[PDB]
């Protein structure tokens, strides 16, 4: 499992973009994406062809005295969705390459906690239980992964987050270069300049034919969709960027990363033998990140017990 | 879980607004949102185009001797729904940031109560049971969150409620600026002035064409929908505002916030050692709010026992 | 749970009114709510427009020598349904405000009775069982709610019932002012004066057009629906009114409210120590109503035991 | 539960009448309930209007040298269904008012019998079991209901049955006054006089129009439905009437009502102390009817044991 | 339950007749039951009316040099189905009136046998088991029903069977009087005289109209259905008649009715005390039929044990 | 249950014939079973009538210089299916008449074997188990059926098989007399003489009309179906005939019927007392067939044990 804070905006982003793309493709593959009218005569076969013709071939707009992105929006959107989903796969491949495994360990500690957090018998001996079964498992995983490219796992995660933020900004750029910078156009539309006093974003366009005046139905759903995707992509971008900055400052500092651990270790009413600094040096590279992931998935109570137990038996290094 | 009193009007509000928006969009995307009639001749292709033309392009109304919001209602409504749902997400993110966790603790005490409120054996020793398992959990959570930005959690909640009330009023304003103040128009309609003696809210409108007289079907479902959304939004707004005022006066007073707790503590037939004031100072910032949430979700009986037990073991501070 | 006697006519009323409203709206949104015929010529586009025109615009009726409520029935009906559902929500909010909680207590005693009314072992000690587990719960609830605005809960209930009866009469008035007083019209229809010798309730009406003779299909389903809703609303109104009068006389008398309790207490073959009057004064405001609700939901047998047990341990007041 | 003998013809009656009414309404709301033919010309819009016109407006029939009940059959039928369902609701409300409760007691004895009629251990002590658990419950119910308007419960039931029989006859009268007395018309149809040599029941009728000769499809399904409903309603009526007479003679006699009880009490090979007459006077008003209901729902074997046990412990009166 | 031998031809008969009737009604209510052709001109509205006209009004047939049962077959068939189902209901009502109950007893002995025919422990003591639980139940039922109109239950059953056979023959007569006696017509069709050299059973018929030559599609499915229903009804009739004769000779003889019982009683290797004749006189009226029903439903093995046990304890009479 | 070897070709035969018949009936009841073309003019109502006319009335075929079985194939096929299903019902009725019951006994021994063929405890005492429970049941059934027309049950089975084979041949004859003997026609079609150089099996046929040239679509699916049904029916016929011959030679010989039994009895390493001939005479008429059925349904291993056990306790005759 994994409940990464606001890295699950890949999920919602993929869903929203893919549903928009599928809706638009089903629209201009099922319904009528255009209508045409020449003022001479029809036979229900003129129009059924001029529709496809004026749609495929370009159209141009004029005021009432050749913008054609109809062929790229509902495809660039699916490509955006795929590129938003990629970074999660990157992180999973990277954790597979790191030697360790987070899914197994988190699921294991979760199952143990859900098994015997309720049993009234296993609650007075609350810390001995965590000291017996799951902490030995976590320590065995640490000791087994320590000998295979797991001393920079935090670096791998923060690199994945850098990739995620850069990807968000690149998707935003790809969107805004598909035609002006958003709220200017919105204010132009909020003041009452809809499309005939604007030029861009047309809905009544003439057609070349060797004066066909075809109307674009779909174009009413686009500029009510860019107005929204702009806001939502910029929000996603700044959220992922503040997450990236938090993680990079976490990694670089290395001194205020042990805040939560030192606060956890100040609860067990023993303080038996082992100083923190030797414990941390025993838990330096990886465990400082595994404990963070455990705190993120399980909570704080079922993680303070874990990190206390992992101190009471730290004997593989010191 | 959470059963917040009349903060679950975000749920019903989102549902009603989104279902209205989806119904209107499906209507003027499937059925015919307009009909047109010119008194010369038709070919089943004149009308199938003039419909879209007169719909996209503006229309104007005249008496029987250019109001066009057709392009903003079924979108502003979905935006309203989203903005109504936002504050719940704000509160969840804020409680995640507060350090503590309400969902876990409330679910835990609920599960414990539902497990052994029925077992006849665990009912004579009713208070020792609550003193053993769940109260220790709550106290451990308090002591662990006390060291991480959890001393103003009530302030965070009341700030969320301020945001919710302001949002309700802003949604009401957005609605009423989409065209006069409600019951005036209703009385004008209750006295028998439907639309031809009114001007606004038309259903038979002429169309420019280089005398088309197009009829707007949908416009019969709008002014039977604004009349209702006005009432419902003002009701939601005043309810959320009285909730906000209750919470802000709760936080500001700090003296009549301990009413329910002092009334709970006057039931256990012991009154063993610990004065209330030291107990309250031990439970000052957070616990006074956790107990309120417990009373709100579980009831009063399975909360009086909890707050009594949490007094009989208060030894982390005093 | 709750099985309130003939307050569950809010359920059936909401269902019938809402299903009628939805049927009529789906009818004149899917089928043809009107047909028109001019004796000149058609093109399958004249009629498809004149239908909507003559429907939206008014129509007028003449004998064979401008009644238009088509735009208010299938909406006023949904509003009626909502206003019928309101009073149950009022009662639930009021019981939440009263401090006590009926749902929890009734469900608890029901679950206890359904658990050990069958077990043959727990039947000789039938009264000791009710004296141990559930009666202590009920008394704890009473003692905890006594200190928070629960001394007029019967008044709250009877106020809700007053509201319900007034609402029934107001809905009846709203219906009858939508056009004569019912059985007069019915007898006029039972003697063989259908619509052409009556004037009102037309089905063949002329239409203005700058002699269209449009027929109103739907109008055959209305005056076969008012004839029924009149009867049903007056029945609901008088039932709710006799319930309201019963409750108001219950509350006002305060002396023949203790009939069922004094009859229950005359069964346990002990009559141990406690006089009734001190018991009643200990159970004065609230418990006299909780016992009534228990009798209403569970029955009489699983309530006589309850009220006997609650006498054998009455020691919080006397 | 309840398996009332041939009072469950309310169930089958409601089903048959409601399904007929729904079928006819769906027929002349979906299909074509009439067809018209004028020998001049059509345009697929003449007929689509003349259908509704000649249907709503009256029609008249002539031989081949203004009967119109099309607007009352598929509504009077639904009203009949409702009025057939009413008496069961009357009986349930009356038993709720009687103070006692039959559903609970019958379900209880049924559950007890189904639990331990199979267990081989609880079969030698067959009568002690019935004497312990369920008979005490029945006696407690009797003693608790005796003090609240339960001394005429048999009178309430027989009054409900009187109402049911009168209702059956009134429904039959309502049917036969909708147009001759049944088998006369049937024999007229069995001898080969279908409709043109009869006058009534037409299928080819002329239409007023300022010689349209409209054909009535539906009228082929009516006089094949009255022929059946007549028979079925008269059968239901006489069955309910013989049931009513049986019950009224039961109540009035009061002496041959104790036949089944005296025959039950002649099986237990003890005849311990209690004479029948004192037992009956202890069981006079109500229990003589509860035992009948038990015999009707459970059978005779699981009721003879019950009435024997209720004799072996009759000590509340004698 | 009940597995009556070839009285379950009411089930298959009702199914076949009702499915045929429903198929034919759906056919000439959905598809086209007739087609018409006049050699002048059509407008897709001439034929859509002449179909209904020539269908409702009669048609007549002529050779190539007014038979109309289209309006009675798919209704008389449903009536036949109902009248075939009736006798089972007669038998159930009659067994309810007899005082005894077969369903309960047969289900009880079946459940007991299915419970402990497999358990290896309860198989050496095979006859003591049947002597303990179920035989006492059967004897109690006999002794309780003996005092209420159960001494002619075999007569009731054989009367029901008489009714069933008479009903079968009457249904056959009703069919054959709907137009010649079957195999004559079949042979006329087996020798190659289809319909134009026969007169009856037409498929091309002229129509009166003030030379329309309408073709009857359905008439191809009728005379391929009478040919089958004749055979099947005569088979059902003779089967039910031989069953009736078997039962009437069973009842009348009264001496070769005790064959199976005397053959059962010759297996238990005890022959303890009780002569058969006294046993039979103790089991004279009813039990001789209950044992037959048990043999019919359960088999012979789980009935020989039953009738042996019921001999080893016969002490209510002798 | 029953797994009769290649008597379950009644199942597959009924399925194939009924699915073919239903497909053809749905074809010429839904689609177009014929098309017609006169070279003058059409109006979409000429053809919609000439189709039915030329279909019902006969057609005749001519070469390119009145075969009509369209009205008997898809009915004779359903009749064939019914007559194929009959013999299984004959066998079930005959086994019901025989006095014994095979379904019960086979299901019983199957359930016993499936219960304790796996339990490791009940496998060393493998033969004592079969000697205790099921063999006693089989012997009791034999002894109880021996006194009621069960001494020729093998004769009944072989008579049923004679009926089945005769029925197969009669169905084959009915098919081949519906028009030449199969592979002659196939070879005529395998050499390239499709239909115009053949005469029979036409697809382009002229129509009488007071030169219509109607084409028969369906006739392309018939002579691709007779070619298959001929082969399949002859295969079924010879299979059922060799089965019949096997059974008749089995019954007639009576000496090589005891082969399998004598081979079974040569496995138990005891050969305790009872000679085979006395055992066989004790098991002469019926048991020799029951053992065969058991071998056929269960296998050989769970039948050798059975027939050994039934020898070790044969004491009802010798």
Task: Describe the model.
This is part of a larger assembly, with 6 copies of chain A (318 residues). Chain A has 318 residues and is mainly alpha-helical. Chain A has 3 domains: 1-31 and 68-99 and 149-203 and 217-257, no CATH class; 32-67 and 204-216, no CATH class; 100-148 and 258-318, no CATH class. Helices cover 60% and strands 1% of the residues of chain A. Chain A has 14 helices and 2 strands; from the N terminus they run ααααααααββαααααα. Chain A has a two-stranded antiparallel ribbon with strand order 1-2. In chain A, strand 1 and strand 2 (214-215) form a beta hairpin. In chain A, helix 3 (73-97) runs antiparallel to helix 7, helix 5 crosses helix 14 and helix 6 crosses helix 14. At the A-B interface, helix 11 of A face helix 2, helix 4 and helix 6 of B. Chains A, B, C, D, E, F: GO terms for molecular function: gap junction channel activity; gap junction hemi-channel activity. Chains A, B, C, D, E, F: The chain crosses the membrane at residues 14-34, 76-96, 155-175, 225-245. Chains A, B, C, D, E, F: It is a multi-pass membrane protein. Chains A, B, C, D, E, F: It holds the Pfam family Innexin.
């Amino acid at each position: 499992k994994g409940d990464l804070a606001d890295r699950l905006n890949s999920r919602v982003t993929v869903v929203i973009l893919a549903v928009s793309s599928a809706l638009l493709l089903s629209s201009h593959f099922i319904g009528d994406p255009i209508t045409c009218w020449t003022p001479a005569q029809f036979n229900a076969q003129w129009v059924n062809f001029v529709n496809q013709y004026c749609f495929v071939h370009g159209t141009y707009f004029v005021p009432l005295d050749s913008i054609q992105y109809y062929q790229w929006v509902p495809y660039v959107f699916a490509l955006q969705a795929f590129l938003f989903y990629i970074p999660r796969f990157i992180w999973k491949a990277m954790i597979a390459y790191s030697g360790y495994d987070l899914a197994a360990a988190v699921k294991y500690v979760d199952r143990f906690w859900s098994e015997n957090r309720d049993k009234d018998d296993k609650f007075k001996t609350r810390l001995a239980a965590f000291e017996g079964r799951p902490s030995v498992y976590i320590w065995d995983g640490i000791r087994l992964a320590r000998k295979k490219r797991s001393r920079n796992m935090a670096l791998f995660y923060t690199l994945s987050t850098v990739w995620q933020a850069v990807n968000a900004w690149i998707q935003f750029y790809i969107l805004t270069q598909l035609l002006l910078w958003g709220p200017s156009i919105l204010g132009d539309l909020l003041q009452g300049n809809d499309w005939q006093t604007t030029g861009h974003f047309p809905r009544i366009v003439h057609c070349d034919f060797n004066t066909v005046l075809c109307v674009l139905t779909l174009n009413i759903y686009y500029e009510k969709l860019f107005i929204f995707l702009w806001f939502w992509l910029v929000f996603v971008a700044v959220v992922s960027t503040v997450n990236c900055f938090k993680w990079i400052y976490y990694l670089c500092n290395k001194t205020k990363a042990q805040k939560t651990i030192k606060n956890y270790l100040s609860t067990a009413p023993i303080k038996s033998t082992i100083s923190d600094d030797q414990f941390f040096s025993a838990l330096g590279e990886d465990g400082l990140f595994i404990m963070d992931q455990m705190a993120l998935n399980l909570g704080d109570i079922p993680a303070s017990y874990l990190t206390i137990s992992m101190r009471n038996i730290c004997q593989d290094f010191i």
